[PDB]
């Protein structure tokens with residue numbers, strides 16, 4: 645067909661099989677989730693969007709899935725990120741120093757995937773799904789991430805870390821999942837400090853991006869929630885990752 649209904653990419657190929665396999669694999673590796681029934685997880689995931697209009701998804705839709713994917717996360721080792729998820733994941737992979745959303749069962753199930761159904765048919769739409777700007781923000785994928793991110797942020801305590809992409813326009817972007825949901829759902833009773841690591845992209849020698857206006861905005865927002873803010877530059881992420889693997893080392 646030469647023109648699609650929505651402006652976004654459509655459901656990821658073999659979505660149901662992909663999601664089921666991820667659930668099997670996650671529940672094999674992580675013993676606290678050893679017991680989860682993956683068919684049921686898939687059935688609750690499907691329940692959230694199938695047969696529903698994909699511009700009319702609500703956080704309620706995902707509550708069955710949220711219950712099934714209930715999980716403890718070490719609250720003081722949370723790493724949040726904005727537009728730099730590969731480095732976040734490479735870092736937590738070394739020795740599990742922190743945990744991102746994609747280290748939880750639900751974040752691992754959905755990472756990199758797209759999905760949406762059709763009102764009053766039970767088909768998955770593999771041709772297009774709503775684009776958040778053009779069509780609607782209340783679509784299956786957006787609503788999932790807003791729902792699961794808010795719960796993850798509510799679970800954090802003590803010092804929470806966030807990696808931000810210092811190669812971008814808006815280092816802190818108030819429209820991102822981190823800026824629109826997670827910053828506002830950290831609980832000040834529990835969270836002492838949000839520490840941002842601003843990841844440089846920029847050829848070696850660079851500015852102190854902790855002075856960027858958007859980082860000052862983030863400091864202001866966080867400080868006014870009664871949480872302390874700290875920021876550090878990571879000037880050379882490749883050197884950082886190496887120091888994480890081999891800290892005894894080479895000019896770390």
Ligand SMILES: Nc1nc2c(ncn2[C@@H]2O[C@H](COP(=O)(O)OP(=O)(O)OP(=O)(O)O)[C@@H](O)[C@H]2O)c(=O)[nH]1
Pocket residue numbers: 727745746751754755756757776777785786789790793820821
């Ligand atoms: N793994 C993961 N994906 C997320 C998270 N929050 C949003 N996403 C998804 O990541 C993908 C890319 O989002 P972005 O790079 O921020 O680009 P964008 O925000 O969609 O820009 P627009 O298309 O104009 O809305 C989309 O599927 C998002 O829904 C999250 O916390 N973790």
